[PDB]
Design a protein around this ligand. Structure first.
Ligand SMILES: NC1=NC(=O)C2=N[C@H]3C(S)=C(S)[C@@H](COP(=O)(O)OP(=O)(O)OC[C@H]4O[C@@H](n5cnc6c(=O)[nH]c(N)nc65)[C@H](O)[C@@H]4O)O[C@H]3NC2=N1
Ligand SMILES: NC1=NC(=O)C2=N[C@H]3C(S)=C(S)[C@@H](COP(=O)(O)OP(=O)(O)OC[C@H]4O[C@@H](n5cnc6c(=O)[nH]c(N)nc65)[C@H](O)[C@@H]4O)O[C@H]3NC2=N1
Length: 766
């Protein structure tokens, strides 16, 4: 057996693995990583944990009855182990049957998911490459991260904005006087990257602290971002940020402080927005006092913040939680409007930024080339979060960005690299709608709730059991890494590439799928490509084997540290207008006006959400800050040793304010039932004043562990927050998810003891 070290990467960073007798025994972070993630050891563990999928399995009821199977029992763990050949024969037969019987509209291939990095072993693209050869499929559009923001921004500033390079960190360090983190916790969220992360946000944050720059955080939770900076902390009732922003804008107009020149020369539609702000249209001036009545933030505080932002070089760095809510489009649209009134857009250190908390935005871009990877080669596309609406309403129409389409009639769903039975909203609704599917196939290397609900489960390998290549730095393009194989594939696990190649072979399309190339053949072609472009661009790169021997190639930064977003638009709006219909920032959109959507007006507007903390006639008393986990990447790593560090009596933790806990006779460490009209879950409480009164925090990603799959509304024993969320569109414009629009009640759990079954494999899978 092998003994030695091997370097590779992941969504958590670059690392060196120590291998002893063919087993990985430790992951040590890259010496050049400025801030490694404590989660790295959970990544190692995920390769060997009790929930690792060993063999290909088929649900017994499905094996026995096929389409006539009782579908209500999916998830009960009654699986039968089969050989790879029979499993592959079955999958290929089912794909062909559905394609022939129902056409491409019958196969849902959106397969949303974070998967693992890698240009070759991209499971979701490989799935689609195979389905394309099979006859076609229904795809998903957008994502769960910025579903609302990515649709509204192109109407306001002309581009998606959320996934674009930010004004460089060093520019902020030298110019910014006030840094505001609005609904953003960069310390927590910068641990991860879509491609390999360089953790560039930490050096930037540390430089701001060293400078003595003033930091203000607007978040209902006193996060580590607040603590690291000793920041001025404002806590609004969740879902009221728009009211606060209107109050600030009203103040700036009232005191005649706003930048009339910026407004006049760089925006369009402020004249149509002003009457609303003044209360002419509805007899309700949007004053700081009015904002206070809604948000709970003192009127004088709202006024002082506005005056401060107006007089200092201020950067508004906003997160995405506030748009993952009902009417989410309004949040960043109003933020940009407020930013316009301040008039600092395009100035070094001023304006706004929507990606400082994500994958290193702001970290200086190098002059390196882009790496390419394998490609894939009723409406045929639906907004990702409308997946259950589609299942329930085949043939019904839906609105999206000014167009109206019909839902296709789906009979099969194939999922890889994703965990919809954890990520999607309103679990109970989803569990029932899933019965409309004749066949559900899943590939994963961990027994997630999604894998447990499959008709056919195929064991995939992790990135550590294969070779790949990937970029370091979504925005910085720091370099290219050789993701070298660390250990041999465990049990009967196979790469998604091999599995799909075998299925395609059975469809008579093996050669079309593989292109006659093997793993290393594909990898070399991607590298050689980047190398051709590199040399043409003046960047020197080694030959393939030389690159592989060293394991990494880094690129030089030329002028990337000087980047200022919107500077050219500000310098000359005549030569460099924006990509909007007017060429200016659209505070009022004529196009959106023409759409006639009741839930998405033509300018930023405060609207009552479905449910909110202290809202009129609200039924439940507490808002659940269902945000991103500190110690998991969504659901990833829940089934590893890391869980021991945060579980409370074996359950997902629930942070609760001492006043809220006392009113209920709840003590620190108690197991509590969190419930509303949609569902009920058990969590373990940690009493802390970190969360504002009226708000509890239960992160998304907990592995749903239902008591009885056949019992409607069954209790989730572990703590999947999505058992409590509603499944509705942000509005007709974007149809984004509202995963953080959640109210619930909590009571100490005194019922019978439950046994956690989510972190051990199904008995038959052992
Ligand atoms: N550690 C970690 N785990 C992850 O799962 C993870 N996922 C990655 C992905 S895909 C994304 S998309 C990003 C997520 O980035 P995003 O900004 O969406 O993050 P969240 O954690 O949902 O929310 C950030 C903050 O918003 C606060 N907040 C919630 N409700 C409100 C509100 O109504 N008003 C205000 N002002 N603040 C509010 C929360 O309390 C939280 O501190 O993180 C990325 N990074 C990640 N890191
Ligand atoms: N209430 C709520 N609040 C939220 O803020 C929220 N965030 C949303 C966001 S922004 C996102 S992106 C989604 C995340 O939901 P997503 O489904 O992306 O979550 P992950 O836990 O990353 O699941 C990825 C799965 O891929 C598997 N996997 C890894 N690599 C491979 C591979 O190479 N082969 C195969 N076959 N499988 C692999 C992992 O083991 C894991 O089970 O949740 C969304 N849901 C949310 N709900």
């Amino acid at each position: 057996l092998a003994n030695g070290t091997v370097m590779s990467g992941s969504h958590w960073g670059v690392f060196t693995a120590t291998v002893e007798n063919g087993r990985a025994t430790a992951f040590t972070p890259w010496e050049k990583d400025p801030h490694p993630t404590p989660m790295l050891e959970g990544v190692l563990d995920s390769i060997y944990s009790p929930t690792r999928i060993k063999y290909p399995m088929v649900r017994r009821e499905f094996l026995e009855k096929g389409v006539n199977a009782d579908r209500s029992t999916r998830g009960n763990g009654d699986f039968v182990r089969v050989s790879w050949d029979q499993a592959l024969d079955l999958v290929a037969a089912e794909v062909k049957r559905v394609e022939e019987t129902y056409g491409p509209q019958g196969v849902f291939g959106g397969s949303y998911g974070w998967k693992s990095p890698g240009r070759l072993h991209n499971c979701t693209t490989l799935l689609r490459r195979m389905l394309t050869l099979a006859g076609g499929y229904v795809n998903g559009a957008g994502d769960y991260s910025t579903g609302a923001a990515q649709v509204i921004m192109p109407h306001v500033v002309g581009t998606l904005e959320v996934y674009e390079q930010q004004t460089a960190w060093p520019v902020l360090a030298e110019n910014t006087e006030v840094m505001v983190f609005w609904a953003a916790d960069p310390i927590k969220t910068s641990q991860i990257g879509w491609v390999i992360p360089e953790h560039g946000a930490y050096p930037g944050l540390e430089a701001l602290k060293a400078k003595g720059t003033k930091v203000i955080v607007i978040d209902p939770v006193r996060t580590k971002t607040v603590e690291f900076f000793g920041a001025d902390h404002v806590t609004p009732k969740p879902q009221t940020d728009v009211a606060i922003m209107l109050g600030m804008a009203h103040t700036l107009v009232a005191e005649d402080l706003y930048d009339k020149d910026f407004i006049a020369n760089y925006t369009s539609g402020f004249d149509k927005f002003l009457p609303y702000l003044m209360g002419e249209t509805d007899s309700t001036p949007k004053t700081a006092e009015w904002a206070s009545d809604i948000s709970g933030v003192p009127a004088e505080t709202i006024k002082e913040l506005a005056r401060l932002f107006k007089s200092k070089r201020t950067m508004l760095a906003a997160g995405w939680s506030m748009q993952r809510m009902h009417h989410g489009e309004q949040a960043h649209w109003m933020l940009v409007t407020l930013a316009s009134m301040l008039g600092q857009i395009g100035l070094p250190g001023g304006g706004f930024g929507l990606s400082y908390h994500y994958s290193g935005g702001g970290t200086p871009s190098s002059s390196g080339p882009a790496l390419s990877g394998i490609t894939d080669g009723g409406a045929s596309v639906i907004p990702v979060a409308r997946v259950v609406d589609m299942l329930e309403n085949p043939g019904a129409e839906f609105d999206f960005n000014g167009t109206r389409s019909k839902f296709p009639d789906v009979k099969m769903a194939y999922w890889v690299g994703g965990n919809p039975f954890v990520h999607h909203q309103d679990r109970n609704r989803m569990v029932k709608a899933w019965e409309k599917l004749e066949t559900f196939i899943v590939h994963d290397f961990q027994w997630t709730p999604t894998a447990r609900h499959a008709d056919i489960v195929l064991p995939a390998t992790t990135s550590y059991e294969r070779n790949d290549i990937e970029t370091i730095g979504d925005y910085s393009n720091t370099g290219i890494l050789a993701m070298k194989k660390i250990v041999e594939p465990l049990y009967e696990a196979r790469s998604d590439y091999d599995i799909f190649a075998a299925v395609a072979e059975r469809l008579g399309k093996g050669k079309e799928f593989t292109e006659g190339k093997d793993e290393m053949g594909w990898i070399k072609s991607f590298y050689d490509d980047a190398a051709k472009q590199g040399k043409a661009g003046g960047v020197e790169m080694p030959a393939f084997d030389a690159f592989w021997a060293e394991g990494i190639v880094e690129f030089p930064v030329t002028d990337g540290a000087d980047f200022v977003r919107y500077a050219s638009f500000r310098e000359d709006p005549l030569l460099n207008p924006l990509g909007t219909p007017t060429g200016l920032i659209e505070i009022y959109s004529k196009n959106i006006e023409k759409m006639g959507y009741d839930d998405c007006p033509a300018h930023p507007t405060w609207m009552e959400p479905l449910e909110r903390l202290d809202g009129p006639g609200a039924k439940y008393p507490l808002h659940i800050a269902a945000s991103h986990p500190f110690n998991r990447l969504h659901s990833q790593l829940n089934g590893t040793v890391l869980r021991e560090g945060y579980a409370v009596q074996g359950h997902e933790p629930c942070l609760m304010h001492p006043d809220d806990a006392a009113a209920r006779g709840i003590a620190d460490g108690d197991v509590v039932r969190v419930h509303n009209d949609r569902g009920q879950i058990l969590t373990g409480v940690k009493v802390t004043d970190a969360v504002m009164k009226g708000v509890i925090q239960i992160y998304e990603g907990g592995w749903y562990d239902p008591s009885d799959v056949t019992e409607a509304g069954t209790l989730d024993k572990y703590g999947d927050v999505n058992v409590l969320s509603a499944d509705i569109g942000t509005s007709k414009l974007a149809q984004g998810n509202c995963g953080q629009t959640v109210l619930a009640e909590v009571e100490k759990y005194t019922g019978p003891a439950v046994t956690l079954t989510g972190f051990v494999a199904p008995k038959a899978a052992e």
